[PDB]
Amino acid sequence: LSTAILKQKNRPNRLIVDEAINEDNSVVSLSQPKMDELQLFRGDTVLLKGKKRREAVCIVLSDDTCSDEKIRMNRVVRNNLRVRLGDVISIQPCPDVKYGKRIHVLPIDDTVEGITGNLFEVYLKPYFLEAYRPIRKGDIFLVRGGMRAVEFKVVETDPSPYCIVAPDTVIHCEGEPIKQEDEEESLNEVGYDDIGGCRKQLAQIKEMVELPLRHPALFKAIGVKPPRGILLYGPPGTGKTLIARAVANETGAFFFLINGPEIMSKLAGESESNLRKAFEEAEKNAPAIIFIDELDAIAPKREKTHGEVERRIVSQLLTLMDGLKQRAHVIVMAATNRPNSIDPALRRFGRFDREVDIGIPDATGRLEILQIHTKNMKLADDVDLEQVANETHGHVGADLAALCSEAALQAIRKKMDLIDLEDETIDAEVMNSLAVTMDDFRWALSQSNPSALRETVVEVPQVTWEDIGGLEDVKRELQELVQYPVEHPDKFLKFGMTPSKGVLFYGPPGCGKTLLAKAIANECQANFISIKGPELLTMWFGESEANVREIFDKARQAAPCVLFFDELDSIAKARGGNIGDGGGAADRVINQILTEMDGMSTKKNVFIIGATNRPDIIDPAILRPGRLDQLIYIPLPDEKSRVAILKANLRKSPVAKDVDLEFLAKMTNGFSGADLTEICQRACKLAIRESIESEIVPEIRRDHFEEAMRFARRSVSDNDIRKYEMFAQTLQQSRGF
Amino acid sequence: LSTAILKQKNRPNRLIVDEAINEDNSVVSLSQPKMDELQLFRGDTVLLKGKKRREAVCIVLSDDTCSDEKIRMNRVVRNNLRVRLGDVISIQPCPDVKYGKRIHVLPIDDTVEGITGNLFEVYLKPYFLEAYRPIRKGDIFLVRGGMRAVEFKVVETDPSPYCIVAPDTVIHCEGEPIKQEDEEESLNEVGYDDIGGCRKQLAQIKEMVELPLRHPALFKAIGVKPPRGILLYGPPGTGKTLIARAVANETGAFFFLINGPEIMSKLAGESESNLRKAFEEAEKNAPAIIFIDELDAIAPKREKTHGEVERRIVSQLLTLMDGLKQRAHVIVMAATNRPNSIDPALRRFGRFDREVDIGIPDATGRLEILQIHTKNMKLADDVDLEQVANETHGHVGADLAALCSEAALQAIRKKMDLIDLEDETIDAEVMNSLAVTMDDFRWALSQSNPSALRETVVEVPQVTWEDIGGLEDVKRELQELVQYPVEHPDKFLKFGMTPSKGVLFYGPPGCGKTLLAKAIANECQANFISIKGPELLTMWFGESEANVREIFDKARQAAPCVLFFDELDSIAKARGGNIGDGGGAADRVINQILTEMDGMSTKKNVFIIGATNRPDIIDPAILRPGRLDQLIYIPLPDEKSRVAILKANLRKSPVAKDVDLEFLAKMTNGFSGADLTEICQRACKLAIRESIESEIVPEIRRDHFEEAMRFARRSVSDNDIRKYEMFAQTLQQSRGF
């Protein structure tokens, strides 16, 4: 019901199509009930448009060539004047459009190449086929007694509609044959189909660019301020320039690209004139889009700058963006790879308030990027893209293109023994029959160094409740504090209470403190930001107080989301504990966390998990009624839950039938979950060794698990069990003394 | 099978050659089955090319001078128009090539030197020898009744093929005799044969430069993006300019060298025009290579710069490299000695993504450099290059050239008593009979200070399993966790488990904590990066947070590789231990190691070793299931393994026969391996003293070892043995409390 806007169905007119044996393109397909509900105006001419000012003409009411009471669609139209079946016809009445001076005809191929002679001897014959020299906007017919592979590039035209040319005007004939680069750089313009992964941000870009420009009166009638400043920020190489280039081609607005280094490459004084002219050009036409690439390169912070020209550039840009009123209809957007260096005077209201985060795509997101990038190459049958999307983790849009290039080149290397190095006249059986296989992708995958290993990884984790063995007590409670306030807000609002925002995890180490948070994030279909203990201590030492500011608000922007603080023990380990150095464990970072976690409003859905295994050195400041008041104890797995833990850990291994899990679960009493995983890893490693020994069968037998128990190592002592139990019954008493 | 691409064999046409007594060069060697499989076109002329536009002509079908049914090859062609036997003939059809204005003949030697007279009296006689003035592209015959040592330098020519000159054109005759420097600086151009050691990086350079330029259509057919930015980085003096100069001479592309300081030597404003002209010159010719030497000198970081001209230069360079599309076919490459000062805006995608590491060569690598450098000098019979390669450790390409220069000059000093200092007319018996001997090399080797002592040393270590005595338990296990996941990935992938990445070494000190890591690195044929304890503490104090970033990723780039953290005790010693100053031992560096070691993907083959001898002060954060979960105990050598330790330590000493190893191994119970090495060192030192005493025999006798036992010193106390045993049984319990 909520997602019933993208669908378009329940209309008994459209039907599925498949491959048929009807390839007769003599006449185009029409519809008899089409004009029956429309009131057209006839008598001189009709104004209509198709796609990219390109339309075809045919015969009208000259049927009776084949059998009626049927329909068909040829597959021939997938290479010109068409991108796919299911294109909506867009017609906008707009007379008096841009016009050139005059162009009649120009030659490209038949200019000087080969024999010329008188030139009216070779193409005059294959022309008289019932056509009185039809002149239109792309009416070209295919007639050839040979290969039927003739094509001439005629793209540039001054008119949108048809027109009648008039005599008594002189035309210059000083043209020149052009190369293929200018046409290829224009035909390969990207659009909304060439971008994948960032399916969410494109909705915002469309709703905030296309809507105000296409319907200016609709926004004025309801009285809404159109956003005129959009800043695109995120990791480098995610494709920030690609959306900017895509939104320009699909809109009828005048696009003006402004580069960052290009502006600074000019001399002193001359650079400001470029910005002034760029704004003036966009101002005199109402549909105009201004994109400033790499804003940080031209608009740095005024508190760190050294040159006086940069300050003048920033001041000029500030004045120019303030001079734009609502009658300009100019949407200024910019892209940068670090939002932190942008001058704060630009990111405030009226200049740049609307911000779009281009984050790192998921396995689903990068799968579509791979499918887009590999759409032009030739792959084999064993080519599995979602696998490669799975193993790739920190890969961004440009990383995938580099990986594809490396995989393609590795395929080139395998054929170097047959392809001559000096002879350039290679045979034609090597440009087509060779495709990229799995050895190529797997080889190139091992030595790929992505540029996106350092940011926060924003997912719904893949860890579900199946990976966690036992612990049925905590599964219900963790749901009761996370899912209820987000699924049924009315039930909470009726009682007039405040849901608790924050849960602390403590207990013996290696028992599921991280898997629980990942599982509770997976089921809620929300994001998951994990921050480790030493991860906070290294990200500070450069004396950077603003580093965590873009971390806390990131969770708020990606609502709903959960915040995880794993390995909290190491954070308190830097100063000790109850006495520590001389006082508590609340060092520089703990105070930061406490100060910022108080500013989160209750009406939000942001949620925080803290996980630690050192309750004796934690400070009372963390456990406040409103920060981490929920204290949940994870006990050691007992006889009943170890079977489930082992079943979860053995889901991917071909375990035998004669092995008894509950039998080997009965003297593994005083262990933890991490100990059981290590036991299983040793047991399966013994299987690998045995399997490879006999080669000079690959199943985990009973003896493989029997040998592991003798070498088993206990991770928690008897004193620690009692100590954990005695803290678990009584923790919050630590507050006060 | 994997390395079957470099070989070229199984063709019954080529055979080995040796020194023969046939030196008749009247006719060249041909092949009768050569045209039998080729369909040539005859009737006017044939187009063909040899090497460097130089070919020889001879008589055709004028045989019957000697016996047939045999073949021979003269040794005379090793000084001109030839570099060696086994050169492939390269022929590329390309008409209409670069042409000059006109040159007929120019005199060089017979211009004004000596007697001239009428000049048509001395060389007209020795010319009429059945030759109707043959004019070609290097058809010179040797005819002289004297020494047969006549040679004139004719190198510059406008045509590649033969041509017929035409009259009715005026030719200027205002030439001048040139010196020998311009010809020597061009004939000594380096190539792929003048560079040794970096055999791996040259493959990447070739595959990423020569392939896209020689076969532009092959890459377009498969749809692969050609790399247009290559950055060469590494230690200074490794030869970064040499590869740049070598790749230009062997390619037919237009090379444009851009120096770093040369650009900045210009005035304000005039420097940008040089870059603009350099790019414009390369753009109008499709085959073009642009090399920017010392990029850091012209493209520094914008956050540290002071002048405004440098920022404009960086912005201009950024704009220019962005303006290059695929139709330019221009590959821009650059070299720098510090990659860290390069502006981050240049090292990202689209400008400089493809990076080549020119590391320090090995003993094998530097051996080839020595062989290349000494190929022009005259050495004696006792000259052993691989020895000198062995003792040289931190020596780079320029260090070896300096060492050779010093060794040559030391040879000059030995003859100063006979060579006159003021008389310049020295006898000819001192420029040839004097060669460099071992006293020269050994003398110059002692006072050589290399410039490459400070980086990370990336090898496969020379320490093998033979150097480690006993410890048969750890040898199998260390293999079972390193070699199996890299040799049989399918066996691991079938069971669907995660191999453990990380092994911690603990135990009594001086027992083989470093030799084990070196041995496991040697057998895997992988790299080995060793980082010591205090080595991390000194590399920090300058408040440099980016220093270790280029350390961790270096191991990933050189896959497979192992990471070693030796002397971990000193790192934890700076803050104490369980209580320490006030808390744990996890100071600034430990948190860094933990944060970065979590980011390594499982699918990689990077592996980490930690070695320590202070398990009581280690913190629980290191021992996490996924960082260093593998805990291996190295016990003290018992009675059985001490014999092997002594045998390993005595492999290079001439040990006598009457000495009994197991007899002296029976009361050396409570020692360690380092104690046995020290015992053997004292025992052999006593032998040196005895050998030199009697001179005013050189074998280690029984009494030499008997005297060492009395002076033996124990390194581990009884309390320490029990304490180590009690921690070894129970370590991981330290996690939690």
Ligand SMILES: Nc1ncnc2c1ncn2[C@@H]1O[C@H](COP(=O)(O)OP(=O)(O)OP(O)(O)=S)[C@@H](O)[C@H]1O
């Ligand atoms: N979602 C995507 N789909 C397809 N190609 C993408 C995508 N994102 C990036 N790319 C490719 O990545 C390359 C570089 O794209 P850019 O837009 O230049 O990256 P960026 O995020 O703007 O950062 P920089 O500063 O420009 S490198 C191009 O070859 C794009 O085609």
Ligand SMILES: Nc1ncnc2c1ncn2[C@@H]1O[C@H](COP(=O)(O)OP(=O)(O)OP(O)(O)=S)[C@@H](O)[C@H]1O
């Ligand atoms: N309930 C469980 N069932 C199965 N495996 C578990 C369970 N709890 C933990 N593990 C395993 O234990 C290892 C680490 O799990 P974590 O949840 O990170 O442990 P932890 O409780 O957070 O304490 P540490 O200090 O991080 S080991 C992984 O290999 C998990 O698969």
Ligand SMILES: Nc1ncnc2c1ncn2[C@@H]1O[C@H](COP(=O)(O)OP(=O)(O)OP(O)(O)=S)[C@@H](O)[C@H]1O
């Ligand atoms: N692999 C090598 N083989 C032979 N000579 C080498 C090699 N590497 C360096 N050299 C010599 O080292 C000297 C300097 O070489 P360069 O290319 O200038 O060094 P570099 O690595 O470029 O660093 P700088 O900044 O130029 S000193 C020359 O005499 C080279 O012949």
Ligand SMILES: Nc1ncnc2c1ncn2[C@@H]1O[C@H](COP(=O)(O)OP(=O)(O)OP(O)(O)=S)[C@@H](O)[C@H]1O
């Ligand atoms: N198993 C062994 N066999 C022979 N020599 C050994 C053995 N173990 C150590 N040594 C010698 O001991 C010395 C130092 O070896 P290391 O492996 O570096 O000692 P360690 O265990 O790392 O502890 P320290 O603190 O570095 S001495 C060298 O001279 C080695 O040859």
Ligand SMILES: [Mg+2]
């Ligand atoms: Mg960009």
Ligand SMILES: [Mg+2]
């Ligand atoms: Mg955990």
Ligand SMILES: [Mg+2]
């Ligand atoms: Mg240099």
Ligand SMILES: [Mg+2]
């Ligand atoms: Mg050592």
